[PDB]
């Protein structure tokens, strides 16, 4: 996997993120993770969405560099959005919301699931250390 840049448009909420790539503006979903809703009635505001949505968009607009990698997969689901890892001055905000617990790993499809057991492993680790949407 090779990572590319990209520009911040607009967090969006906590797992998706409208960004400029290769000049066009373009909605990702982060791969393997789910974040709680601000949005959605089928939902509505759950808990620890707004943090979510604040700890993505916080590292997103405080960062130097974006990146995007996209994975072995489709690089863009049924909605037309990006599925990628995005990082922020190389740290990967999908494993970052993880290991916080304000994301849990989502149900993974093959092949786009390279980051699947390092993902995991964080996410054991804040269910461990009983944060946020684990306490």
């Given at each position: 996997?090779?990572?590319?840049?990209?520009?911040?448009?607009?967090?969006?909420?906590?797992?998706?993120?409208?960004?400029?790539?290769?000049?066009?503006?373009?909605?990702?979903?982060?791969?393997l993770?789910?974040?709680?809703?601000?949005?959605?009635?089928?939902?509505?505001?759950?808990?620890?969405?707004?943090?979510?949505?604040?700890?993505?968009?916080?590292?997103?607009?405080?960062?130097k560099?974006?990146?995007?990698?996209?994975?072995?997969?489709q690089?863009?689901?049924?909605?037309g959005?990006?599925?990628?890892?995005?990082?922020?001055?190389?740290?990967?905000?999908?494993?970052?919301?993880?290991?916080?617990?304000?994301?849990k790993?989502?149900?993974?499809?093959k092949?786009?699931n390279?980051?699947?057991?390092?993902?995991?492993?964080?996410?054991?680790?804040?269910?461990?250390?009983?944060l946020?949407?684990?306490?």
């Open positions: 996997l090779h990572k590319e840049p990209a520009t911040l448009i607009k967090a969006i909420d906590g797992d998706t993120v409208k960004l400029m790539y290769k000049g066009q503006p373009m909605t990702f979903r982060l791969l993770v789910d974040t709680p809703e601000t949005k959605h009635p089928k939902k509505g505001v759950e808990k620890y969405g707004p943090e979510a949505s604040a700890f993505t968009k916080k590292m997103l607009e405080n960062a560099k974006i990146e995007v990698e996209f994975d072995k997969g690089r863009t689901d049924k909605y959005r990006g599925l990628a890892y995005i990082y922020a001055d190389g740290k990967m905000i999908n494993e970052a919301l993880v290991r916080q617990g304000l994301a790993v989502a149900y993974v499809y092949p786009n390279t980051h699947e057991q390092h993902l995991r492993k964080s996410e054991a680790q804040a269910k461990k250390e009983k946020n949407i684990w306490s």
